[PDB]
Amino acid sequence: MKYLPQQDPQVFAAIEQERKRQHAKIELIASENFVSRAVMEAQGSVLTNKYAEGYPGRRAYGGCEYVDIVEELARERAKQLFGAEHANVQPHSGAQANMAVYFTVLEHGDTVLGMNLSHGGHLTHGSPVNFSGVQYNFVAYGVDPETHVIDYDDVREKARLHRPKLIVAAASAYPRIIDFAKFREIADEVGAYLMVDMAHIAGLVAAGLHPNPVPYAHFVTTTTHKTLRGPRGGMILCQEQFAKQIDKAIFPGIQGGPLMHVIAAKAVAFGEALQDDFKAYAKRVVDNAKRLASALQNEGFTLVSGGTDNHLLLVDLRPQQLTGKTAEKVLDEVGITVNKNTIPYDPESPFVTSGIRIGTAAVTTRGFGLEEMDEIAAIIGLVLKNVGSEQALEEARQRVAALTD
Amino acid sequence: MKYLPQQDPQVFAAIEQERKRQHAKIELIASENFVSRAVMEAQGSVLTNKYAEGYPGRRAYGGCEYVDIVEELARERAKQLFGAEHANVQPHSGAQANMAVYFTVLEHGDTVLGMNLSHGGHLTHGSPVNFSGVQYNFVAYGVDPETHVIDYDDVREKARLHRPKLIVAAASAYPRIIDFAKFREIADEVGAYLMVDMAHIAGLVAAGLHPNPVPYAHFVTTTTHKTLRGPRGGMILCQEQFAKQIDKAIFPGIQGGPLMHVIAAKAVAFGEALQDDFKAYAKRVVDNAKRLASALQNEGFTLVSGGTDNHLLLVDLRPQQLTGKTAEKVLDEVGITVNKNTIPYDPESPFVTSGIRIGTAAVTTRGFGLEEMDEIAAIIGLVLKNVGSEQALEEARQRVAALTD
Numbered sequence A, B: 001m002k003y004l005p006q007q008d009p010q011v012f013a014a015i016e017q018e019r020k021r022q023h024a025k026i027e028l029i030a031s032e033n034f035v036s037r038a039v040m041e042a043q044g045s046v047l048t049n050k051y052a053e054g055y056p057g058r059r060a061y062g063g064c065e066y067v068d069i070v071e072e073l074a075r076e077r078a079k080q081l082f083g084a085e086h087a088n089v090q091p092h093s094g095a096q097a098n099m100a101v102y103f104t105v106l107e108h109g110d111t112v113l114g115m116n117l118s119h120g121g122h123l124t125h126g127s128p129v130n131f132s133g134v135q136y137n138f139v140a141y142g143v144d145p146e147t148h149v150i151d152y153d154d155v156r157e158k159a160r161l162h163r164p165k166l167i168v169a170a171a172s173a174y175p176r177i178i179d180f181a182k183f184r185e186i187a188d189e190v191g192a193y194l195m196v197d198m199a200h201i202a203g204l205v206a207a208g209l210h211p212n213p214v215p216y217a218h219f220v221t222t223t224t225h226k227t228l229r230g231p232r233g234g235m236i237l238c239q240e241q242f243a244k245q246i247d248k249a250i251f252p253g254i255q256g257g258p259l260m261h262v263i264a265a266k267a268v269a270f271g272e273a274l275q276d277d278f279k280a281y282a283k284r285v286v287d288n289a290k291r292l293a294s295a296l297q298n299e300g301f302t303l304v305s306g307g308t309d310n311h312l313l314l315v316d317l318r319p320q321q322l323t324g325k326t327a328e329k330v331l332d333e334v335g336i337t338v339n340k341n342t343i344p345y346d347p348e349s350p351f352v353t354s355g356i357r358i359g360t361a362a363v364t365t366r367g368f369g370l371e372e373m374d375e376i377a378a379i380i381g382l383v384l385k386n387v388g389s390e391q392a393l394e395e396a397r398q399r400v401a402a403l404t405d
């Protein structure tokens, strides 16, 4: 940076702290990643200066010839990546992407069936403190109490009982592959639309390492950040038959002017995801998660569902008599970043929890491999088995520092 | 830029076109401005990498110590600028800021009274194709048919008849000072909340050149872009008594993760607005608008309300037998950027219109003064009086190029 340090010492000093923090810590929060310098440059461009309400070639204002090229690059590359008939790259966030889909197909008070929030469902899939749970009548399907895999007969029974207008599949804390074919089968049986929220797994889908929901879903929503490793924002994919309605839902429905600089960054990120080296990256993400899972089990930890098919895992801390809150706090003391997370059938509140959620997308981006996964697991074992030993925590701190250089 | 040109030639080429376009054209779209290099650098920072759901010191995730400092800088500087008891700097956009306020005080189907959309009200103030008009029962007050000034007796009558839960004041195309005291008086009479949407005028309010709605309104919403000259995003200001509810409305109510890099840029922009030179800038904005208005009238144009008190004006093109669409198109041919805009009591559709809206914020940022206003007015006269003369349009083109260098 050149101008910010002189203009705003306070903001710059804080940004520099954050940059150094990102390097120093081991980031295991499953939603996190590190974007490329090219993506950041796109976000830091003069495109922030342009109002571009509407869509390419159909804008409210003149002068959009070049931002139109940028948005179309984003849409076409997204279609290349996911094989979708239509893309809308304007959603400000994953929340707004979901909001738009709900606005398209649902009326106030309509019934929606989503994944149980305590079993892996997202806040925007019907939390009573979120617009989704307030605006619509959400009902939930659960995972099996033993396997922690989605119970597809429960999905079916809930669908047949409650007759939802919309079924939502996908999750923020589900460590296994989701069967989109089965979701669509159930949707078809009850005459419901199927929406898949692939935010967490979008990068893996792009790399062919998780089945693609696009062929099975009427609507697919996602964040552009997370495993896709793009800028912070949202996106909707859908069948051509919904394109006009989806676009109208985003604008003039729920948003105003789009963030054209972020959309440029989205295009950049999609370009990166189209490359062979991103496919190699995504495979390392999944390989690293399996390795970390195995290594954690070797340390004596129990994992929700007994492992992982994707980028993330959940440690069930009940065998260690620890809460997720306690684990999160002590790992923070040694420079490992996780989040407490409810496990299926958790006896604790979401503010305490019996688990921690861990993902490998961020550490993989930093170049961590299998050996590092082993060491991360060993450090977590050292810490969680010795929460009352400052000597153990100091050793952990030193081993964490050794990993981050 | 260093990395984007190599990583993504296509995106870079389009961005460069846009950068050159921004320099070459005369930007008179009233919502537009040009942000500082410091603001852009903040947006292009590593803060995009951080999930920070929640609020400073009360986040969902660990590791937010430094982004907390950034958000608090934004909130405290906003409070300094506007004298508000509380600020929420997380809204992704002006639309989302409004959405959150509506979510806080209204239930589905509640009555809201806003400014007539054809008289200056915004899309998010009850358009039947916007969430506002779909979710809530919007009624409208109008401007006087002769003076084009808000008819405060009409505001009062509509309020007393319809008994709205909420009254919205503020506009996207109103060239005169809004009387917030009168709005609050009317609100008090009918027991309604008052929300002021100051998006267009926020910079002028910050500089003390338009009366501040904060003392009179329960809620004030704004864009951080526009006259405030910040990054693209939103903000809510409110009384301490609504702080908890407003914060909950933004998250977990309507949004997920905030855009921390944009919030950094918001802090930078607020820092700039706190400086004496921003006050001087804002005075030039208003002076330039008055000068341009006067100069346009000298050219024989009729202005909605007979002039301006702020950054913007509207040309009523009926005396010239032109539509806003025609004017917008021909001005585009010579490098002057305006938008067609409905005038009060417009005989034309919003897709055709009888007016063009013009603002001075962008050209003022570029260093244009009174002499340039005179020339801009003369060029507009030359163009609109000679729409069928290619020679006239070429002369206009050359004079536009002379202004932009």
Ligand SMILES: *Cc1c(COP(=O)(O)O)cnc(C)c1O
Residues within 6 Å of the ligand: A031, A092, A093, A094, A095, A096, A098, A122, A124, A170, A171, A172, A197, A198, A199, A200, A223, A233, A234, B255, B256, B257
């Ligand atoms: C992260 C996530 C979201 C929300 O995205 P934001 O950008 O935080 O609004 C929605 N759904 C799922 C499944 C997610 O993982």
Ligand SMILES: *Cc1c(COP(=O)(O)O)cnc(C)c1O
Residues within 6 Å of the ligand: A255, A256, A257, B031, B092, B093, B094, B095, B096, B098, B122, B124, B170, B171, B172, B197, B198, B199, B200, B223, B233, B234
């Ligand atoms: C520009 C504007 C908005 C919307 O802001 P976006 O960032 O485009 O969503 C809302 N209200 C008013 C009065 C505005 O001027």
